[PDB]
């Protein structure tokens, strides 16, 4: 019922070879629609989902232009940050920026965000209220002050509560067939014998969307958190996702364990036991 | 749509 639009940007300095790598991606929920790669011949924001191809030349020239402006700011930032941390020019470093907005079931504005990281660590972030910033360390305090003097929060705040939401609404219209869809997982279970006295139960959940899913193992009606394996939800590569969970049980006790799943797709939350 | 024309320098 609730939707979102987010942009992820990555910039990495390549000290020994011209420009730094710059990658930008856009996402509506868990489905991607745009991309830009500094090292792509195109040097254009490109479509990555059929429902966005629709947009005319004014839209592409605008984003291309905007994303190029992004690629520049970051390029400058890597220099600025190299200085704030007083680092050598020999090693590579990474800046990451992520922003976007979430809308509710009514599709109105719920919240907006803008997070900025350095070398895989929080650097500065726009607070809940969208009027103030949070500085991870003293280096960001310099950017924090600079941004407040440049009234940078207002511009974002205007963007998030305004434009990103209004575009989020638009994209939600043009690609309904896919954006408002929900696919319950195709779930099953497997049993693999081990030791001739112990065994592994793996619980599977495939072809589901969105990517938000849950899996829990229970032992005689109690949550089994230890001795259980769980891998990060993985993409199928066709818009659907995949995820599993395993537990190690002593032999002859497989009926004590029950796998559980939660997902917008399933009308009722499932419960799975090993039958054959 | 992306934020623009450009973002602020850090």
């Amino acid at each position: 019922g609730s939707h979102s639009m987010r942009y992820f940007f990555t910039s990495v300095s390549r000290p020994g070879r011209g420009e730094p790598r710059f990658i930008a991606v856009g996402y509506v929920d868990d489905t991607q629609f745009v991309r830009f790669d500094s090292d792509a011949a195109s040097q254009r924001m490109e479509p990555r989902a059929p429902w966005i191809e629709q947009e005319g030349p004014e839209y592409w020239d605008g984003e291309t232009r905007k994303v190029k402006a992004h690629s520049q700011t970051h390029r400058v930032d890597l220099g600025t940050l190299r200085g704030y941390y007083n680092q050598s020019e020999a090693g590579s470093h990474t800046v990451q920026r992520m922003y976007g907005c979430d809308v509710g079931s009514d599709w109105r504005f719920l919240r907006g965000y803008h997070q900025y990281a350095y070398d895989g660590k929080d650097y500065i972030a726009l607070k809940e209220d969208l009027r103030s910033w949070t500085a991870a360390d003293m280096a960001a305090q310099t950017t924090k002050h600079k941004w407040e003097a440049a009234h940078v929060a207002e511009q974002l705040r205007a963007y998030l509560e305004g434009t990103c939401v209004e575009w989020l609404r638009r994209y939600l219209e043009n690609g309904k067939e896919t954006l408002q869809r929900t696919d319950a997982p195709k779930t099953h279970m497997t049993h693999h014998a081990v030791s001739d006295h112990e065994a592994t139960l793996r619980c599977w959940a495939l072809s589901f969307y969105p990517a938000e899913i849950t899996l829990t193992w229970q032992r005689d009606g109690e949550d089994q958190t230890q001795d259980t394996e769980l891998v990060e939800t993985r993409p199928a590569g066709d818009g659907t996702f995949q995820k599993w969970a395993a537990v190690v049980v002593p032999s002859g006790q497989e009926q004590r364990y029950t796998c559980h799943v939660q997902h917008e797709g399933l009308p009722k939350p499932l419960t799975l036991r090993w039958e054959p | 749509a992306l934020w623009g024309p450009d973002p602020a320098a850090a």
Partner: T-cell receptor, first 117, second 110 residues
Framework: DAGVIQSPRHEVTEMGQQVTLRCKPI?????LFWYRQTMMRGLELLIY????????DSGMPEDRFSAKMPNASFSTLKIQPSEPRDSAVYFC??????????????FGAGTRLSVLE | KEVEQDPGPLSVPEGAIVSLNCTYS??????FMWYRQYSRKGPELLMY????GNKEDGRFTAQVDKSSKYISLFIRDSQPSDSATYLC???????????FGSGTRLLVRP
């Protein structure tokens, strides 16, 4: 009190030559804009820089026009070769990110360019 | 990317209220400002607005009806000193490139 400085303010010249219009932005500003105003067409943005790199030049005529900023405090608008249809008033402007967000631009005194056959 | 504005010249007697206005046909615009230009001199920013709304700033009042793609500037207690050419300008969030109107000449009689 030291604003944008364009140069020269008046230029009367004969076609088939290289006219050079200069502009010095307000020290501290890192966006520079070139505009022209022909009485019969109004204000047109020719081009604008950010940190010295041409960001938008859709306004530039396809050929015979060339702008550039070798440094933060100097931009050049060259027209070669001079033609009458190019005579007009050329303005320059500089500004900053916090100021542009409110569409504030500091304009120069302009340069009246008259090109004669 | 077109902006329409009547050139005037429009005359009004000192002390009256006069309305200037432009219209546009690109929904991408969301920044609207008004410049004032005296003959043989440069343009001076007067009012600026973002999206729809009415902004007061002393004797000036800027308005913008996004539904109608119509912008207006009101000048109260017109003074002969207000005589000049008025230009509107706008843009989107894609570039700092401003698009101007041909301008409306104003002449407030003393």
């Amino acid at each position: 009190d030291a604003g944008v400085i364009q140069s020269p303010r008046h230029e009367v010249t004969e076609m088939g030559q290289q006219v050079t219009l200069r502009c010095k932005p307000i020290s501290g500003h890192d966006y520079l804009f070139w505009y022209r105003q022909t009485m019969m067409r109004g204000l047109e943005l020719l081009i604008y820089f950010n940190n010295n790199v041409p960001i938008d030049d859709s306004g530039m005529p396809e050929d015979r026009f060339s702008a550039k900023m070798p440094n933060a405090s100097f931009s050049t608008l060259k027209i070669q070769p001079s033609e009458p249809r190019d005579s007009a008033v050329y303005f320059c402007a500089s500004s900053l990110w916090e100021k542009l967000a409110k569409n504030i631009q500091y304009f120069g005194a302009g340069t009246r360019l008259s090109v004669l056959e | 990317k077109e902006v329409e504005q009547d050139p005037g010249p429009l005359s009004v007697p000192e002390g009256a209220i006069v309305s200037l206005n432009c219209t546009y046909s690109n929904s991408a615009f969301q920044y609207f400002m008004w410049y004032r230009q005296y003959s043989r001199k440069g343009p001076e920013l007067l009012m600026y607005t973002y999206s729809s709304g009415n902004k007061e700033d002393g004797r000036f009042t800027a308005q913008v009806d996004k539904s109608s793609k119509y912008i207006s500037l009101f000048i109260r207690d017109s003074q002969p000193s207000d005589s000049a050419t008025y230009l509107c300008a706008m843009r989107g969030d894609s570039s700092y490139k401003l698009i101007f109107g041909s301008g409306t000449r104003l002449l407030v009689r003393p």
